Design a protein around this ligand. Structure first.
Ligand SMILES: [Mg+2]
Ligand SMILES: [Mg+2]
Ligand SMILES: [Mg+2]
Ligand SMILES: [Mg+2]
Ligand SMILES: [Mg+2]
Ligand SMILES: [Mg+2]
Ligand SMILES: [Mg+2]
Ligand SMILES: [Mg+2]
Ligand SMILES: [Mg+2]
Ligand SMILES: [Mg+2]
Ligand SMILES: [Mg+2]
Ligand SMILES: [Mg+2]
Ligand SMILES: [Mg+2]
Ligand SMILES: [Mg+2]
Ligand SMILES: [Mg+2]
Ligand SMILES: [Mg+2]
Ligand SMILES: [Mg+2]
Ligand SMILES: [Mg+2]
Ligand SMILES: [Mg+2]
Ligand SMILES: [Mg+2]
Ligand SMILES: [Mg+2]
Ligand SMILES: [Mg+2]
Ligand SMILES: [Mg+2]
Ligand SMILES: [Mg+2]
Ligand SMILES: [Mg+2]
Ligand SMILES: [Mg+2]
Ligand SMILES: [Mg+2]
Ligand SMILES: [Mg+2]
Ligand SMILES: [Mg+2]
Ligand SMILES: [Mg+2]
Ligand SMILES: [Mg+2]
Ligand SMILES: [Mg+2]
Ligand SMILES: [Mg+2]
Ligand SMILES: [Mg+2]
Ligand SMILES: [Mg+2]
Ligand SMILES: [Mg+2]
Ligand SMILES: [Mg+2]
Ligand SMILES: [Mg+2]
Ligand SMILES: [Mg+2]
Ligand SMILES: [Mg+2]
Ligand SMILES: [Mg+2]
Ligand SMILES: [Mg+2]
Ligand SMILES: [Mg+2]
Ligand SMILES: [Mg+2]
Ligand SMILES: [Mg+2]
Ligand SMILES: [Mg+2]
Ligand SMILES: [Mg+2]
Ligand SMILES: [Mg+2]
Ligand SMILES: [Mg+2]
Ligand SMILES: [Mg+2]
Ligand SMILES: [Mg+2]
Ligand SMILES: [Mg+2]
Ligand SMILES: [Mg+2]
Ligand SMILES: [Mg+2]
Ligand SMILES: [Mg+2]
Ligand SMILES: [Mg+2]
Ligand SMILES: [Mg+2]
Ligand SMILES: [Mg+2]
Ligand SMILES: [Mg+2]
Ligand SMILES: [Mg+2]
Ligand SMILES: [Mg+2]
Ligand SMILES: [Mg+2]
Ligand SMILES: [Mg+2]
Ligand SMILES: [Mg+2]
Ligand SMILES: [Mg+2]
Ligand SMILES: [Mg+2]
Ligand SMILES: [Mg+2]
Ligand SMILES: [Mg+2]
Ligand SMILES: [Mg+2]
Ligand SMILES: [Mg+2]
Ligand SMILES: [Mg+2]
Ligand SMILES: [Mg+2]
Ligand SMILES: [Mg+2]
Ligand SMILES: [Mg+2]
Ligand SMILES: [Mg+2]
Ligand SMILES: [Mg+2]
Ligand SMILES: [Mg+2]
Ligand SMILES: [Mg+2]
Ligand SMILES: [Mg+2]
Ligand SMILES: [Mg+2]
Ligand SMILES: [Mg+2]
Ligand SMILES: [Mg+2]
Ligand SMILES: [Mg+2]
Ligand SMILES: [Mg+2]
Ligand SMILES: [Mg+2]
Ligand SMILES: [Mg+2]
Ligand SMILES: [Mg+2]
Ligand SMILES: [Mg+2]
Ligand SMILES: [Mg+2]
Ligand SMILES: [Mg+2]
Ligand SMILES: [Mg+2]
Ligand SMILES: [Mg+2]
Ligand SMILES: [Mg+2]
Ligand SMILES: [Mg+2]
Ligand SMILES: [Mg+2]
Ligand SMILES: [Mg+2]
Ligand SMILES: [Mg+2]
Lengths: 38, 208, 141, 174
RNA sequence: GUGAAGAGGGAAACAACCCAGACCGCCAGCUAAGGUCCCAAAGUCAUGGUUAAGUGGGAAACGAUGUGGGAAGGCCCAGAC
RNA sequence: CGAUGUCGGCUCAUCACAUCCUGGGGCUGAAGUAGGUCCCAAGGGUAUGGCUGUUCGCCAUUUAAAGUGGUACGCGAGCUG
RNA sequence: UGCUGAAAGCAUCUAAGCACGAAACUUGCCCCGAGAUGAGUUCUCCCUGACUCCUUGAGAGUCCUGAAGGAACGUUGAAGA
C-alpha cells in the first residue's frame, strides 16, 4: 500500500475506514488503491 | 539433577573406528545428600549434597553438627541442586555416577584458572598498537577510553585491565563418553574449567 | 511565645488499612502521601515524620482511566552505557504490582531523608492477606 | 438504532436465560453463552427479544444493534447450525479428516495438522474439498480463515485454499 | 520600559518578560502577578458545556462519514436513500 | 586570546535510525528465479589490498552485507606526526 | 493479515468482543548479586556467673569466667601487585 499523507478516494469502489486511529482507504477492484495514513 | 566432582587431568579415548576423542577425566565420588529443602520450609524444592572426606579437627562444630543431623560423614564442602518436580530424594542417600549413564550431554561448571591481573590485550583481545613506527611508551596500552566533553566520562562496563579468571564459568553440552562405576569416573569430550584437582559441578544438558 | 513543634518521642503513630481494589491510582496515591506525610494531623511539623502507618492491600487491582493500562510507561536507566529499560502499566502489574503504588507515592512524597523515612511507613501488598494483624490496623477510606 | 428496532424471533425448544448481562441460549445443536456489553439492556417481550440502549451511556444505539445481530446469529446457530464450504484448488493439494484434526497436504515438506477448537464438525465430501459445520459463526469463521491462511489464493492460477462463494482476481504474466 | 545601577514574588531553573521599587525590627493582617490533587501555602469549590487525542503537554500545506453547536437548502407514505 | 592543541592514520569506542545485510510485511509494469518500491524493525553483523598525507575517490579481488550520521568534523595529560 | 460485527436494513479488521503476527520487547541461556539499610530466608553451632553503685538508665562499675568461632603465627598453593 501507499502511506501518503493525503489519502483519497481514487476509484468508485474505494472506501475510507478509520482503523486503530489511522485513516485507511480499502478497495475491492484494484488492490493498488489500498492506502494508509493522513 | 547434578553431581559434584574433582577434575583429574585429561586423556584421549581411541575408538577402533580411527578417531581419538580428547576426554577430561572427572572422578565423581559418592555424592551424599545432607539436607532436602522443600516448598513448606524454604520456598523452593532442592537438595544439598556433599562429597569426599574431611579431617576430624579441620571440620568445625557448626558443620559437624549439620553433618550429624543427616548421619553422613563430613564431606569436603557443600553444594546444592534444584529438583525437577518428578524426582525426589531422601536424606543420607549416596548418589552414584550411574545417574549420567542414560544421558548423552552435560554442562560442566567450574571455577576457571586464575590468570591474575590481566592487561586489556590478554583479557579483552585488544589489539596491540604499532610495535615501532615511532610509538612512544604505548604498545600494549588500551588507547582511548572515551569520547570528549559530551559524556565527559568513561561509560560503565568499559573493557579495562584487571582480574582475569578465578571466576565461575560453564562449558555447555559436552558429550559424555564413558561412565565407569567401578573406579567412579565420568569421561567427557573436551576441556572443562579449573585445574587438575579443582571442584567441578557436572549436571545434565539444558539445551536438549 | 514560640510555637509548637511535634517532638518525635511524643509523636502518636496510628495504623491503617486501605483496600485499593478498583480505586484510581493517583487519587489513592495522593491521599496516601497526605497521610504518610502527616498533613491531616493538626500537630503537623514539616521537619518531623508525624504521619501514620498505612497498609495498602490489593495493589494489583488498582484501576487506571483511559488507555493508561497499556500506554502509561515506567522508564528507568540501569546506570549503564546505553541501558534504558521501559515497562508499560500492564507489564508492571504482571511482574511487580507493588512497584505501581510505591512509585506513585514516592513521587508525591518530599525528596530527602524525611521523605525516605515517611515512605518506610507505607506497606504495599499484591494480595488481600497482610501479616500486620498485631498492630490492629483500622480501616481507612 | 434500526437493526436494534427489529425484534429477534425465538423458535420453540430454544431455552434462553438472561443472567444480568450474561446471556445463555441453549438449543438442539449446542449451548451458547454470551457475556454482553454493559451499555446494552436486554429484555424478553412476548415471543421475541427486545434490544435497546441504556440512558446515561454515550454510544447506546451502536452497542444495541450489535447485541441484536449477535443474538440473531446465535439463535440461527443453535437452531440450524452454520456451515462453510472450503475448496482446495491445484494439483497435489488435498484435504483429509481423522477425528477432530484436519490433515492437509498443501504442497509443503511437512504435514499441516490443523486442530479444531470447540464444537466444530468437519468433513470431506471429496479429497479436494472441506465442508465444516458448527454452532458459532465466530469459531467457524476463524477456523475457515486459519485453513485459508495456510495457502491463500495465488492470483495467477487461483491455487490454494478458497471459500466456495469467493471470487478470485487473476492476472497475466508480464 | 526594564536591566545596567533594583532586591522581593511569578515565569520549573531564567540581568533584559509579568507583578512590584527593599530605612531597620516584629512567630500580626490585606492584596498583586501567578495560583489552590500530592511534591509545595491555598477550591479534589459550585454550576453549565467541550475534548478520548495523555489532546492539554512542540510544528505547515494538504488529508479524513472523529465529534459537539447553529443556520438554510434538497425531495418524498402517491413510502425518498 | 593571563592558550578551548584544529587534517588524516592507529587504539578504543558509544549512541541515533533517515536499515547495508540479516528478520517481518503491502502493491507491482510480482509466473518461478531475480528484482522495483514503500511500511515495521537498531538484536547482532557490517572486507583486505593498490595509488595518494589524504578524508573521500578510482581501481583489484572479495563479502550475507562491505549502511548513513552524532559524539570538540568522538578519541594527542591514549599513540603517531 | 483476519474473524465475528453495530454506528450507516448494505458495506466495514473495531466502537463492544475474538485470533494470528518479527533477529526488536519481557522470558528462556550464562555470570554477578541481601550495603535488596526493603540489609531477606533456612540449617547448624555456642554462652544458663556472682556482686556493688547510682539521676528506678537500653545505665558507670567490681570480682569471676573466655564458649562456638576468629585473628595472628608458621608451612604454603594450578590463589595472588
Ligand atoms: Mg494492530
Ligand atoms: Mg522456621
Ligand atoms: Mg577441608
Ligand atoms: Mg594463579
Ligand atoms: Mg599481558
Ligand atoms: Mg578489541
Ligand atoms: Mg597492530
Ligand atoms: Mg618520535
Ligand atoms: Mg607520550
Ligand atoms: Mg619522546
Ligand atoms: Mg611494552
Ligand atoms: Mg554531567
Ligand atoms: Mg452528550
Ligand atoms: Mg461473514
Ligand atoms: Mg526589574
Ligand atoms: Mg557597567
Ligand atoms: Mg528584579
Ligand atoms: Mg525574580
Ligand atoms: Mg520557562
Ligand atoms: Mg515551581
Ligand atoms: Mg524562583
Ligand atoms: Mg534583574
Ligand atoms: Mg501585563
Ligand atoms: Mg523605597
Ligand atoms: Mg520605604
Ligand atoms: Mg488573603
Ligand atoms: Mg480584595
Ligand atoms: Mg492577570
Ligand atoms: Mg487573581
Ligand atoms: Mg523543594
Ligand atoms: Mg496544600
Ligand atoms: Mg491545600
Ligand atoms: Mg477532600
Ligand atoms: Mg469531586
Ligand atoms: Mg469539582
Ligand atoms: Mg465540575
Ligand atoms: Mg459532553
Ligand atoms: Mg468524553
Ligand atoms: Mg504532547
Ligand atoms: Mg507534537
Ligand atoms: Mg472530504
Ligand atoms: Mg457518522
Ligand atoms: Mg466527546
Ligand atoms: Mg451560525
Ligand atoms: Mg585571560
Ligand atoms: Mg586560565
Ligand atoms: Mg588541552
Ligand atoms: Mg584529526
Ligand atoms: Mg593505515
Ligand atoms: Mg582505526
Ligand atoms: Mg556494544
Ligand atoms: Mg547504535
Ligand atoms: Mg526512503
Ligand atoms: Mg533496504
Ligand atoms: Mg538483499
Ligand atoms: Mg536467513
Ligand atoms: Mg525478510
Ligand atoms: Mg525465515
Ligand atoms: Mg523482505
Ligand atoms: Mg512475488
Ligand atoms: Mg504496508
Ligand atoms: Mg524505521
Ligand atoms: Mg544496541
Ligand atoms: Mg534497545
Ligand atoms: Mg532478545
Ligand atoms: Mg553488542
Ligand atoms: Mg560499515
Ligand atoms: Mg573498508
Ligand atoms: Mg571497483
Ligand atoms: Mg559516514
Ligand atoms: Mg575541537
Ligand atoms: Mg558536526
Ligand atoms: Mg577531532
Ligand atoms: Mg561525518
Ligand atoms: Mg604524548
Ligand atoms: Mg585528535
Ligand atoms: Mg584528550
Ligand atoms: Mg602518555
Ligand atoms: Mg616531527
Ligand atoms: Mg618527520
Ligand atoms: Mg455485518
Ligand atoms: Mg449509507
Ligand atoms: Mg451516513
Ligand atoms: Mg463483511
Ligand atoms: Mg478483509
Ligand atoms: Mg540467527
Ligand atoms: Mg551469591
Ligand atoms: Mg533502615
Ligand atoms: Mg537474616
Ligand atoms: Mg525470622
Ligand atoms: Mg528460625
Ligand atoms: Mg547528673
Ligand atoms: Mg584461655
Ligand atoms: Mg585468658
Ligand atoms: Mg574449650
Ligand atoms: Mg602468599
Ligand atoms: Mg606466593
Amino acid at each position: 500500500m501507499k502511506v501518503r499523507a493525503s489519502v483519497k478516494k481514487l476509484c468508485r469502489n474505494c472506501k475510507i475506514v478509520k482503523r486503530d486511529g489511522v485513516i485507511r482507504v480499502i478497495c475491492s477492484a484494484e488492490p493498488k488503491h489500498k492506502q494508509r495514513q493522513g | 539433577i547434578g553431581l559434584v566432582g574433582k577434575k583429574v587431568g585429561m586423556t584421549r579415548i581411541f575408538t577402533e573406528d580411527g578417531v581419538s576423542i580428547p576426554v577430561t577425566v572427572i572422578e565423581v565420588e559418592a555424592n551424599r545428600v545432607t539436607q532436602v529443602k522443600d516448598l513448606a520450609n524454604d520456598g523452593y524444592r532442592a537438595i544439598q549434597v556433599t562429597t569426599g572426606a574431611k579431617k576430624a579437627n579441620r571440620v568445625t562444630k557448626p558443620e559437624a553438627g549439620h553433618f550429624a543431623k543427616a548421619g553422613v560423614e563430613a564431606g569436603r564442602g557443600l553444594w546444592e541442586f534444584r529438583l525437577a518436580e518428578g524426582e525426589e530424594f531422601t536424606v543420607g542417600q549416596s548418589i552414584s555416577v550411574e545417574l549420567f549413564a542414560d544421558v548423552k550431554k552435560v554442562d560442566v561448571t567450574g571455577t576457571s584458572k586464575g590468570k591474575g591481573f590481566a592487561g586489556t590485550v590478554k583479557r579483552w583481545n585488544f589489539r596491540t598498537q604499532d610495535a615501532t613506527h615511532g610509538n612512544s611508551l604505548s604498545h600494549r596500552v588500551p588507547g582511548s577510553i572515551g569520547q570528549n566533553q559530551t559524556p565527559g566520562k568513561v561509560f560503565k562496563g568499559k573493557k579495562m585491565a584487571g582480574q582475569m579468571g578465578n571466576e565461575r564459568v560453564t562449558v555447555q553440552s559436552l558429550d559424555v563418553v564413558r561412565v565407569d562405576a567401578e573406579r567412579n569416573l565420568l569421561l567427557v569430550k573436551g576441556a572443562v574449567p579449573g585445574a587438575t584437582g579443582s571442584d567441578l559441578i557436572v549436571k545434565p544438558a539444558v539445551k536438549a | 511565645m514560640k510555637t509548637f513543634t511535634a517532638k518525635p518521642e511524643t509523636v502518636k503513630r496510628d495504623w491503617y488499612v486501605v483496600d485499593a481494589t478498583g480505586k484510581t491510582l493517583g487519587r489513592l496515591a495522593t491521599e496516601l502521601a497526605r497521610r504518610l506525610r502527616g498533613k491531616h494531623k493538626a500537630e503537623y511539623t514539616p521537619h518531623v515524620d508525624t504521619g501514620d502507618y498505612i497498609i495498602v492491600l490489593n495493589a494489583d487491582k488498582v484501576a487506571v482511566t483511559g488507555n493508561k493500562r497499556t500506554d502509561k510507561v515506567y522508564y528507568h536507566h540501569t546506570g549503564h552505557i546505553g541501558g534504558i529499560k521501559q515497562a508499560t502499566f500492564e507489564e508492571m502489574i504482571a511482574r511487580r504490582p507493588e512497584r505501581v503504588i510505591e512509585i506513585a507515592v514516592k513521587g508525591m512524597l518530599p525528596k530527602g531523608p524525611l521523605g525516605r523515612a515517611m515512605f518506610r511507613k507505607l506497606k504495599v501488598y499484591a494480595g488481600n492477606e497482610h501479616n500486620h494483624a498485631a498492630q490492629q490496623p483500622q480501616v481507612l477510606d | 438504532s434500526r437493526v436494534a428496532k427489529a425484534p429477534v424471533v425465538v423458535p420453540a425448544g430454544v431455552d434462553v436465560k438472561i443472567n444480568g448481562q450474561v446471556i445463555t441460549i441453549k438449543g438442539k445443536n449446542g449451548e451458547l453463552t454470551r457475556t454482553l456489553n454493559d451499555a446494552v439492556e436486554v429484555k424478553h417481550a412476548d415471543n421475541t427479544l427486545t434490544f435497546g440502549p441504556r440512558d446515561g451511556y454515550a454510544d447506546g444505539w451502536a452497542q444495541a444493534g450489535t447485541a441484536r445481530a449477535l443474538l440473531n446469529s446465535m439463535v440461527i446457530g443453535v437452531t440450524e447450525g452454520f456451515t462453510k464450504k472450503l475448496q482446495l484448488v491445484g494439483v497435489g493439494y488435498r484435504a483429509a479428516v481423522k477425528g477432530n484434526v484436519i490433515n492437509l497436504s498443501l504442497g509443503f515438506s511437512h504435514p499441516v495438522d490443523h486442530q479444531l477448537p470447540a464444537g466444530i464438525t468437519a468433513e470431506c465430501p471429496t479429497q479436494t474439498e472441506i465442508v465444516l459445520k458448527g454452532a458459532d459463526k465466530q469459531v467457524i469463521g476463524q477456523v475457515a480463515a486459519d485453513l485459508r491462511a495456510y495457502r491463500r489464493p495465488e492470483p495467477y492460477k487461483g491455487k490454494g485454499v478458497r471459500y466456495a462463494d469467493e471470487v478470485v482476481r487473476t492476472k497475466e504474466a508480464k
